[PDB]
From a paper:
Nitrile hydratase (NHase, EC 4.2.1.84), comprising α- and β-subunits, is a metalloenzyme that catalyzes nitriles into amides. The NHase active site contains either a non-heme iron or non-corrin cobalt, buried in a deep internal pocket, similar to most enzymes in nature. Hence nitrile substrates should pass through a tunnel to access the active site, and rational tunnel engineering might be a plausible choice for NHase substrate scope modification. We rationally refined the tunnel entrance region of NHase from Pseudonocardia thermophila JCM 3095 (PtNHase), based on substrate access tunnel calculations.
Two successful mutants, PtNHase-βM46R and PtNHase-βA129R, which exhibited high catalytic activity toward bulky substrates were obtained. To understand the mechanism underlying the expanded substrate scope with bulky amino acid substituents, the crystal structures of PtNHase-βM46R and PtNHase-βA129R were obtained and analyzed. Both structures had clear electron density at the mutated sites. The βArg46 and βArg129 residues were located at the “upper entrance loop” and “lower entrance loop” of the substrate access tunnel, respectively. No interactions were observed between β129A and its surrounding residues in the WT, and the side chain of β129A was also buried and oriented towards the interior of the protein. In the case of PtNHase-βA129R, the side chain of βArg129 formed a salt-bridge with βAsp49, which maintained the side chain of the Arg129 outward offset from the substrate access tunnel. In addition, entrance shape and size analysis indicated that the entrance of the PtNHase-βA129R was expanded compared to that of its parent enzyme. Introducing β46R and β129R mutations into PtNHase resulted in an 8.2-fold and 4.2-fold increase in activity toward pentanenitrile, and a 6.2-fold and 8.3-fold increase in activity toward cinnamonitrile, respectively. However, the PtNHase-βA129R mutant lost more than half of its initial activity, suggesting that it is a stability–activity trade-off mutant. The maximum entrance sizes of WT, PtNHase-βM46R, and PtNHase-βA129R were estimated to be 39 Å2, 47 Å2, and 46 Å2, respectively.
Residue numbers in the entry:
A (entry chain A), B (entry chain A): 2 to 204
C (entry chain B), D (entry chain B): 1 to 228
The structure:
Amino acid sequence: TENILRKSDEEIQKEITARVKALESMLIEQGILTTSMIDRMAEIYENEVGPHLGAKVVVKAWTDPEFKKRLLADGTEACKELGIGGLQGEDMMWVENTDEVHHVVVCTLCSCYPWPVLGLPPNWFKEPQYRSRVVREPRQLLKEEFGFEVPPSKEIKVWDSSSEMRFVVLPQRPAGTDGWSEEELATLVTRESMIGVEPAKAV
Amino acid sequence: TENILRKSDEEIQKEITARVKALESMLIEQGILTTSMIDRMAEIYENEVGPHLGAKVVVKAWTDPEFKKRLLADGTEACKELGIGGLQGEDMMWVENTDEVHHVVVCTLCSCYPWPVLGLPPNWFKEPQYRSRVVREPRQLLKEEFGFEVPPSKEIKVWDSSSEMRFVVLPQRPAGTDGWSEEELATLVTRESMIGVEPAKAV
Amino acid sequence: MNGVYDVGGTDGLGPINRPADEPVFRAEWEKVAFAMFPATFRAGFMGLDEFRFGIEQMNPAEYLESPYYWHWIRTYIHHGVRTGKIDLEELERRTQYYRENPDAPLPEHEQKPELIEFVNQAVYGGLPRSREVDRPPKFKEGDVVRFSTASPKGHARRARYVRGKTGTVVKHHGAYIYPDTAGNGLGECPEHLYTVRFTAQELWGPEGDPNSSVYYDCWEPYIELVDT
Amino acid sequence: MNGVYDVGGTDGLGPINRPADEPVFRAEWEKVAFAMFPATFRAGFMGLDEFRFGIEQMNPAEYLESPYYWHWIRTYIHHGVRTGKIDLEELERRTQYYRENPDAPLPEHEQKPELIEFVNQAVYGGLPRSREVDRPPKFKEGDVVRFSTASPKGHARRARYVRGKTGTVVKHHGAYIYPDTAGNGLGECPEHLYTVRFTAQELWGPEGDPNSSVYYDCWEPYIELVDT
Ligand SMILES: [Co+2]
Ligand SMILES: [Co+2]
């Protein structure tokens, strides 16, 4: 939004860059940060941990009703069956979309997101626009910002992660996909379908 | 407070100035604003209407118990006795400081202030620091920001002007002033003593 | 609306910045912004409540740190565009022009006697918002009432820190213009007005001062009976 | 605290700014800010709750419009100064130096094996906040409870939009680190944790969606019984 007080983006980027490099040089000198630590952390969440992990759990739940029951009983233990877990997903609770219920997820207080199944969140999830309005006008927000019209008879359930319990949406299996492989099904599971801002892909 | 995003004050002043002159030229051309209208409005509140008006009401109330009763019954009608009234003071309610009660005034929603008795308010009254904290920590705020220590046994009453009722504090008459003239008493009535952030001057 | 402008009880906003003295107007531009208030009200840009609502819809980072009278400019622009009295693109071109020619003259114009008569009448006579209504007051001094928990998306005078709270009616002032309608282009629809008293422990919990109360003015629809 | 960071239900903040795609890290500086989180936690700068509290004490105009990972830098600086691990004046001189020599080298340093072992153990194994406690749970699925109206000045997980509201316990998760103590330097003092369900009409009044509910996680001291 327009703010006549705010510097340009380029001016802001230059200033943060110099401030971050200043702090970095101090932590490095104090023994507590190193350049290998930075590359190791960045390389995990640029290359290893991402929404494809969560896609794996969704299609196993779609194609295996025993896993699905265990995934809804204890999401952390169930994801461990596929070797999926860890930082900021120590406590996961998965919630199932139905014909009657739609689930959508938020951290109104900051940016909590189930990293081990989804990776790091996109910036709009962490920013005040989505955070403020989802708990108050979910239906209009899903329509206007995501082109997803949820019928007024269908309950929208919004899950605010005020604690370390991380909430993940299990989206509905699209029609037209009987007998598809786990790899073929996996192409319909988006990051957005696991937040609840979109359904799984059609067709 | 530090905001790495914010332009310098000089940059901000230059930008507002050009934006205000742009709007001014459009209203002028449309017939609805003129330069004489600007000077007339500014000259009223730079030279005519100010805290000295409210001082007059305070010392009459100090030295005339009948007026004081009428001032507390209906502040608008009572101020009219001294020819004092008008814009943004159509509805005034005055509240009396005692040994038992201290009153302080705020508009937490914007900047409401009894203009006809006090003039235009100072900027700190209209700004978020005072507005946010007075209703929540009046005692600590009066101490830290105004050097005014209100004993914990003394009730602090905070008056939020959510409507057009404007609230004005009648401060206590300082000791050591028996028999003083209205003009001599008038030297102890500050703008601040009529908001309630300070008492009247001592000695 | 639940805007950040409604700062009563907000923590973390910082120490007060208070010079020992300051002029009424810190720069010529503030005189202009201030005089625009009667000019713009007479021309029908907006009402007093609509005025407040346009400040409340500001960018909140902008609201929190701008010079005060810039809030007034924003609400002028907001209502000018909404009523089509202000061409936003012409405003932008003019702003650039005056960025580069700050001493450039204003446009030539007749002075208007009636704009001075209006200024003097509003300032000395007042623009009262009291109104007569046919219904009698629901409430009376000493009644115990509970502030609404409603959260309208439009303009209202319902500070977040008093919603759901319990108070004592202290004074009935008569009826006045109702902001929940006037500020949303729905007319004066005046309502009876009350000062209600709230203890600080009712408002803040145990973190409230044990010897402090807050008086907040509530229009009749804002409150419902608990006890007489 | 009642900080503007607590934006659930705040109106007027604008449309969402969502590109179709974006990298994990938009500039090298964000990788650095992100990796500082484990570096700074291991060095004892602060805890997870203290981490949140330092973001919450930001300048709110700054909080509302800065790039996200700048919030992390702020909380690093905040706790470094408070624990004296960071000399603020040396930080300022270094910032100027790197303003003017942006490609200047970092200081020379040993790489540390144990910092990589720590990164890998936290990321794959987790840093759980579950804890055992001696007391049993006060509440159970189906109990009707009312969220506290308390407004602590320190760190807490009490979104303004749920205070005073009435819900149904939906799940008991066990006990976890209590933020009202941990985030204020008062220790883990773990408490039993519950998901409570609130209707949107309970939360927003008649402006709430008629077919919507919000689930918010409450630690035991946040809620007291209304009905089993
Ligand atoms: Co978060
Ligand atoms: Co005001």
